[PDB]
UniProtKB/Swiss-Prot annotation, chains A, B:
Name recorded for this polypeptide: Cytochrome c-552
Binding site for Ca(2+): 298-299, 354, 356
Source organism per UniProt: Thioalkalivibrio nitratireducens (strain DSM 14787 / UNIQEM 213 / ALEN2)
Location in the cell: Periplasm
Activity dependence on pH, as recorded: Optimum pH is 7-10 for nitrite reduction, and the optimum pH is 7 for sulfite reduction with only 20% residual activity at pH 7.8.
Amino acid sequence: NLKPVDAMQCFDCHTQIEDMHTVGKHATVNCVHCHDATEHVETASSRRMGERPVTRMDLEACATCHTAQFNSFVEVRHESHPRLEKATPTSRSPMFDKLIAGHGFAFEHAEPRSHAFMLVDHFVVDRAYGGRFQFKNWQKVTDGMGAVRGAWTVLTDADPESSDQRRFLSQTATAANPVCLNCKTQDHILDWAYMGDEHEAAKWSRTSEVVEFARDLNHPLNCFMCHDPHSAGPRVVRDGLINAVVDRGLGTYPHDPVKSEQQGMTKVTFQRGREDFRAIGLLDTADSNVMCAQCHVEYNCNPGYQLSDGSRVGMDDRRANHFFWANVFDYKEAAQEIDFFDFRHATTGAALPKLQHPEAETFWGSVHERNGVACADCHMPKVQLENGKVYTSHSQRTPRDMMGQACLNCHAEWTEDQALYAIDYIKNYTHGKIVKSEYWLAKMIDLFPVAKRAGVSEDVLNQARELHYDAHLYWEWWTAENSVGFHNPDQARESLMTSISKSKEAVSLLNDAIDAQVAS
Amino acid sequence: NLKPVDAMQCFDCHTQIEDMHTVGKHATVNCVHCHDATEHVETASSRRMGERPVTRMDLEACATCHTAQFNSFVEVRHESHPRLEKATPTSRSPMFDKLIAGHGFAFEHAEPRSHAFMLVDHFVVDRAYGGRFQFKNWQKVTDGMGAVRGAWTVLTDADPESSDQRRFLSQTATAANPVCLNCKTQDHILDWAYMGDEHEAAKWSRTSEVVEFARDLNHPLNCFMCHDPHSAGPRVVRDGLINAVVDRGLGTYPHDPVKSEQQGMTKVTFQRGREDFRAIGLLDTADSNVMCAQCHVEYNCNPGYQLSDGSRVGMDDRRANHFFWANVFDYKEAAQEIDFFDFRHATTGAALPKLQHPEAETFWGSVHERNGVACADCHMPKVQLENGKVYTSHSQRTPRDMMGQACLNCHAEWTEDQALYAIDYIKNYTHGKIVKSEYWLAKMIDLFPVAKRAGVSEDVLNQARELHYDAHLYWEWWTAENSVGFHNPDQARESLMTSISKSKEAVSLLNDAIDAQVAS
Amino acid sequence: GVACADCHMPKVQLENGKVYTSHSQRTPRDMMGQACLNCHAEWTEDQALYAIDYIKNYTHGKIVKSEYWLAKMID
Amino acid sequence: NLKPVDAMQCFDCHTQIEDMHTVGKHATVNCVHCHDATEHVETASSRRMGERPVTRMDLEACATCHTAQFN
Ligand code: HEC
Ligand code: HEC
Ligand code: HEC
Ligand code: HEC
Ligand code: HEC
Ligand code: HEC
Ligand code: HEC
Ligand code: HEC
Ligand code: HEC
Ligand code: HEC
Ligand code: HEC
Ligand code: HEC
Ligand code: HEC
Ligand code: HEC
Ligand SMILES: O=S([O-])[O-]
Ligand SMILES: O=S([O-])[O-]
Ligand SMILES: O=S([O-])[O-]
Ligand SMILES: O=S([O-])[O-]
Ligand SMILES: [Ca+2]
Ligand SMILES: [Ca+2]
Ligand SMILES: [Ca+2]
Ligand SMILES: [Ca+2]
């Protein structure tokens, strides 16, 4: 059985913790629930750590007193189809392979599934670690609780004796790097300096061997990613988000200085050897929009190239850990701001961006966001009980599974069927425009080899390549974003119509140039 | 009412039957249930048949005493979508038409449905008989019991006065030949010599007019295909399977000599005029893996061409009735072994194999097969009754309809939803790789006209054609096979990654050659 | 060695989660999988219910007859 | 928000509770979750209760850490 430790002894050296812990709703929660610090206490001095204390990062550390939230969180939604490839005629992006050719996502890009699996799915996806990590067997794919208990309880490593990124299966890629993991786990929270910069106190950084880093990590989406374990107050821990909101002064709601002020973030820094080491962002309110934006954003977490001169931007560069914190119509300017693109298209040669799940940036300025609605209202609402103590559901999933609490409490005029119909109207319309955008992108892409082989000039090809950047951006935002337009239907419609406009312009340009070469 | 005949009188000339019948569980079942032999008995001699006895081939001959198994067998699974074309974006092979161009399956290749319909579906499919045979009207498509009663009770013939294979509808083919029927019916069991070789006692052979043959056949999947009617013991009757297992000494489990010995087959031959005529294979055990492998295999049942010199291999050749009895990674060697390919691709000119439903060969070496599981355990399990005499379900269908008996009795740790999720994980992953394999195959195929028109050398084109053979094989195995990877997920993944590797190699080869011709 | 809680407040079974003991003390009819069938693998839910009812029906018949005779005496 | 009390101070006069509390699975659960003893501690001796401390009997005293069982 746990025996409490004297927190006062701790507080004598840990004033920041004292100020948070003594004031919040965890004032009675003893340090022993999460820390084993006996040898630490025997050896530390005022400013030197001595022996390192053990810190529990497992979610069961919270489950002891918060079983309801834990159980809600680890639930697996079986209806969320597993390992479902997006590049298929029945999924999100029927022409993805042609459009993304040259990027690592061509190796595999599946639809998301339940949060319990985020770390194991990151480890096993074909694009990440060359097939190095796999489930112990095909049965383990169901085991949400097991994944939560630890990735390495359900996965194998093809070669424990090497630590280099390489392909163990022919059609895999090795795109994973240490920045990825910040959106899968925060087990490394005490071993990673702010932004993944080099730091004497950091075991891991942007430049680490990711296979070695991976083996040190176990748990998905730790409860403390949104809740400070000392104060129990709302927070974020994701460095890239703090950097955008605070360091770059953009605010929690970049479009709304008033809301940004009312619902802001305070950056709190922790030091090692009296030098800044790590940071968190304490929230003024329990604002899920900002909590979820730790991960559900467009980001850089990868090497790339400069737009200016095409030179390599490596993991060592700060730009390899970057939140653009920009909506689709501000994105091109945001990418120019850091002089960055992701890949060159394998067929057209165009410099292109790679877009990822920008739910937070898409939601901005939507009717629901402007009305003060937040992710949790639709995706993790309060539980309604005929008799019971209310708690917040932690099963982050589609509102279709809980329409009464997600939608109909606000929309009293509608039945469930009518609310579903309204969602489907938007999704169906948006998907049709996504498909049409892909059709026009593919038509343009297919003209590039014809143009080059007909002797069309580099000047015309480069014009078309500039059009490709825009056509790609205004399309891929929407295959990347998970709501199929629902989060901001007017924006999706304007963006996708712009993509088609750009592709059509490029098609006409190339067809005309080709025809002129044929006429001599 | 039936009157019993004196079996002892029969046994005086039929010693083989006596040895089987007197010993097995049909020792009390009188010959009159299946044979009308009055005139036969009056005219036969020790070694000459005299007047031919009537032998019932209808399944209702067994239904009289085995109603439960019969009723189970004739059940129609309405949820198994009928006449569903595989070459569509929502089915198995979205790019099938491009990839299979040059083969008869381009005319129609539907998903399989319930066993009751196998013979009528064979007769009516657009690729088989030039549209000659059709259901009497569109209502008959539902009539499983009617099809079982006899194909000609539900079908019409566009021209009873001719017997040549020809097109009655413009977009049909005439691919059917007498070998096909061996996997649809065994009504011809006494009229077909082993392998379909020419034989004085055989009415029908590989070289017969298939339209004439068709008119003589009525019943699907006769009960006696798996059960000897005389001994009631387990057997196979399919010549091609006996040939692979016994004549070629490959064994029932070619990968496992021990299991092959424990679960083997004994070839029993029946003679006409003291010359070998037909054969069956008696099984040591009631092994559904081998019973189902009578049909659910990759086979040759068609003319083709030699790999060596491209010369025609006709129905007269033994190779027109061939079970390769080889897994995907042994197939190319198996096809080289008999010097055979199926068709030349209409666009690329490559010699290609045609793969068909290799469930048996795919299942070999899988985790379930190695653990002693067999087709019937998942597809035709014992019925569970609160009160009753247990019998084996004969409704061969997906385990999704009976998960408790097919999966969960073995997998106690899982709910139905978890077991379904595990299946879908594998199927979703495999389908994504199938789609990607098709993308790369199509990309390569489309480069062939460009290459030929740019004046790329025959040497380079032939290199690409050799790559096409392998890319095609390692893809088509999996659109042909019905489990979408479930029967052997690691093998599907390795094979499909190989297909993509081959296509990518060919694409690079052709693109480079084209570009060199453009640069002069 | 069976106790009240085994039938009236059994452990919750979850596909994924931390097990806890149900504190809803109620008839096992509402949770037959966990209250009965985990021990009685030979039975379906309907068979287990049928066995309960056989006993309850029989006992209640004897209760009613006992009351009939008591009332006859009292009168 | 609840502020923890010095349980060791309590234990100087409550050895019977000490022997139970320090050993079981509530060793880390502070007295303030169920007792309001500020005035008691101001006035008690080991042989004189002084002001009577308040003890919570409501089930929500447990529901705070054991919501699943309470619900
Ligand atoms: C779980 C409910 C915890 C309780 C109770 C206590 N701590 Fe904690 N602590 C916990 C986590 C998950 C972390 C990682 C960092 C994060 O912000 O999540 C920490 C970290 C610390 C640190 C390091 C801060 C730094 O300099 O980087 C200290 C000094 C610390 N914790 C002290 C501490 C004390 C004294 C506690 C008893 C009053 C205590 N913690 C309780 C989780 C939990
Ligand atoms: C028992 C020893 C606990 C441990 C372990 C954890 N928490 Fe806790 N938590 C506990 C109590 C008694 C309370 C106060 C309840 C009340 O409403 O009075 C809390 C509260 C929280 C809250 C709400 C905070 C707020 O609204 O300001 C959160 C978000 C919370 N606790 C989170 C949390 C996390 C993430 C834990 C693991 C690191 C964790 N708790 C452990 C008791 C206990
Ligand atoms: C936070 C800014 C993230 C970064 C850094 C990485 N990922 Fe991610 N990932 C994130 C979210 C919010 C989601 C779900 C939404 C969605 O559109 O998928 C994911 C999903 C994945 C998945 C599962 C789906 C799939 O594409 O197969 C995988 C396998 C995955 N992510 C891998 C991955 C890699 C390799 C990363 C570094 C290059 C990486 N992620 C970073 C959020 C974030
Ligand atoms: C960000 C993605 C979160 C993660 C990770 C965790 N929780 Fe959470 N929690 C989150 C929100 C948006 C809320 C509601 C806040 C509001 O006031 O609207 C909560 C709330 C809690 C509470 C308070 C009681 C309740 O409302 O249920 C607790 C005790 C709590 N959360 C616990 C908890 C646990 C145990 C987690 C790991 C399994 C966890 N949270 C993660 C957002 C997020
Ligand atoms: C209600 C007004 C919502 C708000 C607030 C948020 N989301 Fe949403 N989301 C909503 C709908 C109707 C849908 C489509 C779901 C469906 O079943 O059709 C979605 C979708 C998502 C998804 C994908 C879920 C899935 O398909 O299984 C994600 C990952 C998602 N939304 C994230 C998300 C974020 C991060 C939010 C705050 C920035 C957010 N949602 C708010 C409705 C609503
Ligand atoms: C149905 C339950 C039957 C019973 C009863 C009997 N026979 Fe049979 N017989 C039956 C079938 C379907 C066939 C076709 C071949 C096959 O293996 O399925 C036969 C065949 C024969 C033959 C021919 C063997 C040969 O030389 O090719 C003979 C000589 C024969 N049957 C004899 C026979 C006798 C004597 C029976 C009474 C003891 C008898 N059969 C019963 C189906 C059934
Ligand atoms: C009644 C006159 C029958 C006819 C017609 C058919 N079968 Fe039969 N079968 C019959 C009996 C009395 C038995 C023995 C039952 C027992 O378990 O004691 C059988 C048995 C079988 C079996 C099981 C054999 C074994 O396990 O070794 C099979 C597979 C079987 N019968 C098949 C079968 C077939 C295919 C029939 C049509 C050709 C057929 N039976 C007719 C009685 C009668
Ligand atoms: C009476 C008002 C009818 C209605 C309502 C439906 N059906 Fe019908 N159908 C009817 C007749 C008299 C016939 C012809 C019978 C014959 O054998 O000549 C039919 C035919 C069909 C067919 C066959 C079509 C073909 O081209 O051969 C089909 C597939 C069919 N009917 C189906 C059908 C369906 C699905 C209906 C509900 C939408 C339906 N029918 C209504 C009479 C009437
Ligand atoms: C045994 C080795 C067979 C040979 C010889 C033939 N077929 Fe076949 N067929 C077989 C199986 C096991 C299945 C179901 C599994 C599947 O993948 O389809 C089929 C299916 C058909 C169908 C229905 C599905 C379809 O493709 O439309 C038809 C119409 C069909 N088979 C026709 C057919 C022809 C024309 C054949 C000779 C060229 C032939 N079959 C031979 C097994 C076997
Ligand atoms: C191969 C594809 C089969 C066909 C054709 C028929 N049956 Fe069958 N039968 C098959 C199997 C795999 C089994 C189970 C054997 C085992 O011991 O596991 C059976 C069993 C029977 C029996 C025995 C009693 C029982 O288990 O139900 C009988 C009487 C029987 N089968 C009858 C039967 C009938 C009437 C058929 C035509 C409608 C028929 N079988 C075809 C495999 C196959
Ligand atoms: C359990 C371990 C199985 C074994 C043994 C066999 N099959 Fe199977 N099969 C299995 C699954 C989970 C599926 C997918 C079904 C679904 O609904 O997703 C299949 C599929 C098939 C099919 C197609 C069925 C359909 O889609 O309707 C066929 C024709 C098939 N399997 C044949 C087959 C053969 C011949 C087997 C022995 C060699 C065999 N299966 C074994 C599970 C299992
Ligand atoms: C007994 C006759 C079984 C049947 C019926 C089903 N399964 Fe099975 N399965 C069985 C065993 C003994 C094992 C191996 C256990 C181990 O850990 O070694 C399996 C394995 C699986 C797997 C993993 C496959 C892999 O390649 O790793 C899966 C996904 C699986 N089983 C699923 C499954 C399904 C969906 C079934 C119903 C169609 C099913 N099994 C039936 C034993 C038996
Ligand atoms: C007697 C009628 C009880 C009442 C009053 C309460 N609980 Fe209980 N509890 C009881 C039993 C029989 C058990 C299972 C013991 C075993 O090991 O089999 C429990 C268990 C708990 C636990 C431990 C964790 C768990 O198994 O769920 C807790 C934390 C718990 N009970 C809490 C609790 C609460 C909050 C109560 C008031 C709402 C409560 N118990 C009352 C029996 C009885
Ligand atoms: C948070 C500050 C708590 C309060 C308030 C209550 N309990 Fe508790 N309980 C808490 C913890 C951290 C634990 C240990 C969890 C573990 O297993 O590590 C417990 C445990 C129990 C148990 C199980 C004890 C056992 O020996 O198995 C029970 C039955 C229990 N708690 C009951 C209980 C009651 C009745 C409460 C109101 C008087 C109560 N707890 C409050 C944390 C907290
Ligand atoms: O404690 S030391 O820093 O004097
Ligand atoms: O690759 S992750 O960003 O989905
Ligand atoms: O019966 S005859 O062969 O002599
Ligand atoms: O054509 S048959 O083999 O499916
Ligand atoms: Ca999903
Ligand atoms: Ca990006
Ligand atoms: Ca089917
Ligand atoms: Ca073939």
